[PDB]
Amino acid sequence: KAQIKQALKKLYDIDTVKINTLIRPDGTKKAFARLTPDVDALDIAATKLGLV
Amino acid sequence: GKAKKKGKSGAARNYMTRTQAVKKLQLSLPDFRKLCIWKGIYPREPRDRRKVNKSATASTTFYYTKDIQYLLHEPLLQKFREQKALEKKISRALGRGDVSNAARLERNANLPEKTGKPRYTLNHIIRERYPTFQDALRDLDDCLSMLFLFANLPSTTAVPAKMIARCERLCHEFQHYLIVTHSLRKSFLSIKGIYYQANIQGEDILWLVPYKFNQRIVGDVDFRIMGTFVEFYMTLLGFVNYRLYTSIGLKYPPKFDQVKDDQGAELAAFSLEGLNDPSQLFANFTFFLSRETPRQPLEFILRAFGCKRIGWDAVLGEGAFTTDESDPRITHQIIDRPGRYPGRIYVQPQWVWDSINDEELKPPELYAPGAQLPPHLSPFVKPTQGQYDPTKPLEEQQTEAEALEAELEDAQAEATLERQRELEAELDPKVKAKLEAKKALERKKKQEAEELERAKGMLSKKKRKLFEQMQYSNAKKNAEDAKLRAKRRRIEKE
RNA sequence: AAACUUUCAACAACGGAUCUCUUGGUUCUGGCAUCGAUGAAGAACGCAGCGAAAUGCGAUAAGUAAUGUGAAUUGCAGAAUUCCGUGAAUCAUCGAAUCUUUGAACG
RNA sequence: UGAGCCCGGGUCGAACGGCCUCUAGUGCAGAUCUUGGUGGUAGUAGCAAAUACUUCAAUGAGAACUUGAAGGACCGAAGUGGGGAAAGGUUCCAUGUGAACAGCGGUUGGACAUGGGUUAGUCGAUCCUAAGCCAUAGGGAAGUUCCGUUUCAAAGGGGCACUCGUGCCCCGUGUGGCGAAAGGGAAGCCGGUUAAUAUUCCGGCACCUGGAUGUGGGUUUUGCGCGGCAACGCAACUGAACGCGGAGACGACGGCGGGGGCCCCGGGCAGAGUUCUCUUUUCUUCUUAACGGUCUAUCACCCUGGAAACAGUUUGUCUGGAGAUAGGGUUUAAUGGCCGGAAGAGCCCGACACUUCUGUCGGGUCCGGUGCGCUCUCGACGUCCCUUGAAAAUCCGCGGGAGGGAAUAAUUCUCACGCCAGGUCGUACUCAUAACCGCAGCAGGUCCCCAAGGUGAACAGCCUCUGGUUGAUAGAACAAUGUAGAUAA
RNA sequence: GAAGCCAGAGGAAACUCUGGUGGAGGCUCGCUGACGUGCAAGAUCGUCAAAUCUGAGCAUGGGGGCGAAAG
RNA sequence: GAGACCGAUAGCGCACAAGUAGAGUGAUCGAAAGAUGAAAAGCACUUUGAAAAGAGGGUUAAAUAGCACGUGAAAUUGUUGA
RNA sequence: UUGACCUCGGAUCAGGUAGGAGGACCCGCUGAACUUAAGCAUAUCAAUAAGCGGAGGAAAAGAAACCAACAGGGAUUGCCCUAGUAACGGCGAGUGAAGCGGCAACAGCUCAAAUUUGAAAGCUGGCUUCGGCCCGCGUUGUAAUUUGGAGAGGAUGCUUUGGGCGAGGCUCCUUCUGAGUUCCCUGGAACGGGACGCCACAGAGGGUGAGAGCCCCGUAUAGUUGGAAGCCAAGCCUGUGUA
């Protein structure tokens, strides 16, 4: 979680309130990063993540 | 969530006790002390000594962990280990009888007893302690104090005679730099010795040099600590002198004529060549210096502020501009004795120090021989409002109560109402005015006391404790000051 | 008479024999001598745009560097190559590298 | 003559033959021969028990075993219920298909294909040791290796010092590791939310551990605070080395008492049901978490006083000049009461809404009673035993006195407030007459948690509430038989 | 349903009875062989199995004859 | 590099995703399984059918070669005729 | 008090080494039984299989404490016969060599035992500008000389030398090197049949729509291009010390 937070802050300029991680059955990790109220998840996803 | 232990984080791995540091470094206590002195590593006070170490007492010294890391990574420790191995090798050779190999191994061992230089090179240590010539100038005060002390002290086992000689050499070279650049500023005589303050590149350097006698050495004074300090300060002053000389342009080191040193020139055994308001005080003068007078201090002063022609008795040594006392080409002569040549100004050395002190030629007829010398002032305390100053007069530095008291002293040098009415039924101006003034002032003091008591009651417990401490301190200060002006008053009445 | 049982023939089923073929085996002969703490043999997990296995490779991951050849790969998709060029290739050679977890396996 | 040889017709596509020698893994009906394939038996035997299904409608080419509604049955809290351990591994969930499997079918499936799904400082692992085992010192053995587990091991710690002389002191063993997802152990609850995760997501409200540091407060120029006879009380009120102690840390049973939940009885509100007739009637809602504050006590302990004309007292026993009765106090507190949480929640009911995201507003959520009832926990007492009832990690206290100070402050104060942080792995589902094993989707085996009511003497039988089934290839004919073995009728 | 305790009645006491309170038991309910001894022509007495159920971990003992065992 | 060798029940167990699939708690045990066509040119379009498939039509020298694919025996079976 | 030497330890000290795999062949240890024959028992299987340890491209052996009895041979190893002989065995089952002789291949050497004693002359490190500086090991012996078909020491007179470059060459990979797609028929497709030619130190093999020397890769001999590492070597620089 510390590395995930540091990477999100350093690269994509995302501030996160918290991070919850699990390991999927296939072997990959899934991370739910809950962001600060100041930023908007929809705006960040549309701009930096390219997700509609 | 890790279940962290109690004393495994924080100040525990921030600070380290002295015994733990010594065990970690694997050093003897003398070696640890020498390395700490050379590197400028000092004990620190943690916030909570129990958190640092639950078994730590009030007498436990704590050391910075990162400073212990610097000590661990110092190469001088490997140098120390190499020296210890070498010393074991000389012991082996001497115990077997190989005198030539013992001599060779000593030559490699580089002892201060024969070299005259510190046994270890401290170049990187000095560079890291003072990465700036300004910092070097800022600790030259202690440096010079140490070297002058040991240049006057005798020789010991920890401090070789040759290393005393090299300390004297370095002190003289620094004095010549001060002479040539006229950066010496001010001087002061004390019951402890002579204090010199100079200004090198905007930095004030103050040092003390004892009077030339047998500086008595008594008690448990250890010269090994002093020896380490002397070694460090010798290397420091050597580099300071080198930089100052290459800045002025002169050649370093100046030539040292062992001959004139043998006949005792001290400063006059050096010839400084180059490379291919302050200085007017005594320039157009001619000074001759008695046998009872401190030649080294007086010569330093005169050569620092202008007098280029100084002579003295042959017993003082070589370098005198003239040794003949009867010589008619003389201006001033210094005595402190209890041929009376007319063309001569005879002065007592307080004249020299007061002249250097005030930058104005002091009255010689007041400073004349055999006369009760005027008080000597200290050129170091700045005028601080609220504290006694010997130069300002009582009339403008008294307290009002003592002023009125002095006025009444100079003057002399309800119930009454009712009684006067009943009796009636059946010098003075000034003295009265002063006595009503006294009672009115006392009334004002009582009112102020009442107000202060009301407030001091209108404080809380610890707050009032702090306030009482401030009152105690200020009361002691004004009490000492009151004693001072009382003694002024008795002086001035007499 | 039909149906049923049996017989003969043609076609069609079931099944994989015969003939043919063989990037496989088996035997003989000839030149050579080369594993490993600089971490071997073996095991494990990952790596392709679209891959499960075999193969190759190791977070530089169906691979990088260098040399040579000289214009491909291919199932599809998308890019090339200017071709009068340090340069395509699931290419060959190969002297530099990368080389995850164990395994003699070594805090 | 014969083993055989030759030609014709059809099929087919790539090599083959005659003659003389040479050569050999060279000729088949069997060997209960080997392998492969195929028959008759034969559309035959056979497709069990768990009482049991029926009507309409929808989907679909196709419906006994796909679904919705209704009817009739069943499991009957010791379940055909709700969850875990072990084991399995994606079987969970959504969509699509019907080639193979589900002794019949199939639109269904734990099948097949394509996507998705498991969110933690507080739940487990991670830490500790138990019985036991392994390395090390050594010693055997030709050797792979064996014995050995504290042994005739230089095995492990800590402190002090003006750098007088680069030293000197003490203290103690089995000197390390493994072994427990039921032992020990710091700390999280309620409501809501998805197709599939909830003490993990969201909202509200908390806690614990570790670190750094400031303010306030406490002590201090009488050095380390006050009160009470005592039990002891408080906002903190010096304390090194060294030593001691406590908690962790503990058997089984019996009745008794306290408390909380469950069951039962009554009234009241709201709603639902029967009602030819009767029934001021029957059923359902009426709930309150962690955490914090405050009040509450048996045992125990303390003071006065001194007992047989013995007293006190339990269901029982017993207790008392080794200090009883009596009078007066201190103290250990939770799942107990009150408040905050917290009614704003959850639940019940009513009214108004109508492209959708789905809404808006009203009321209520109350008061009692009882017990040879059930269950959890706590407490005193008694009895018995293999008789002081595993160890370690971890937390606390005490003794001892080494050392230690504040004048524009010191503080080795466990007090209040302020600041920061909390990593890694599992989290889906099943746990069984279809998910584990048994050759299998086998009437079999497999560890634990929760446990309502009525008739009823009953822990006998029977029947229901919650929840869950209607599933064992189906139709027609009749379906209540025969034999065997046991059972005091 | 035994010890222990209480009350009444006789006994000088020890006791006995009755009524109880109590709830300990190598006590009950649910659906034989193998030998040894024998002191006679075989009697009696003794010994040996049949040993709380169950998950997860762990250790040990194994044949024969000889012999007093030690071996 | 070769052979008077074997030629898919032969030759090594393995000509193939063979020490594989699978069996056993385990040490270990251990198969079956090659071939369309020169070239996929692997059947467009129409019709029936829910689909699987079928019939026209088409590719090729050949579908009497349709990815149940060279040639295609007997056992056994169906239709037709005697 | 100090310091040597001996012995025994510590270090995550500086630098190294060993384990495991493979095991066809090779060097050792350990070590059966089935089977066969014989009244019985030894024997045979077999100094084998299985188990354990250890190397290499080969291993091992090896330069006589040998063979021999001659007119003598001359380290080791392997082939042929010797020879189913000698020899041991109820002189059963049976077991079972070697010398000579012909061949293949050939190669000899190093220490301990002497005193360098007119000179530890030897060697490991690690510091290096690399040229030489120190720490050590070692006299309880590291160099030179000698190893019994020898040798040492003196004398004597002849006879032999040592290093560094190195053109070029050999070995091995690589580039390139002959001639029909001429006409007719069958054919889906000629690589088949007929006709006329060509190459060949190449008519081996394979592919290409059917049997192809001349369509393609290749195939034969000589060269030719570039590269790789070992070895040899014409020559050219030097030599040195009473060695």
Automatic annotation (TrEMBL), chain A:
Superkingdom: Eukaryota
Protein name: 60S ribosomal protein L25-like protein
Similarity section: Belongs to the universal ribosomal protein uL23 family.
Included range, full protein: 105 to 156 of 156
Span of the signal peptide: none
TrEMBL record, chain B:
Species of the source: Chaetomium thermophilum (strain DSM 1495 / CBS 144.50 / IMI 039719) (Thermochaetoides thermophila)
GO cellular component, one term: PeBoW complex
Name of the protein in question: Pescadillo homolog
Principal subcellular localization: nucleus
GO molecular function terms noted in the UniProt entry: ribonucleoprotein complex binding; RNA binding
Family assignment from sequence similarity: Belongs to the pescadillo family.
Coiled-coil stretches noted in the UniProt entry, renumbered to this chain: none
BRCT domain residues: 277-369
Taxonomic lineage: Eukaryota, Fungi, Dikarya, Ascomycota, Pezizomycotina
PROSITE patterns: BRCT
HAMAP family reported for this sequence: Pescadillo
Compositionally biased intervals (Acidic residues): 397-410
Superkingdom classification of source: Eukaryota
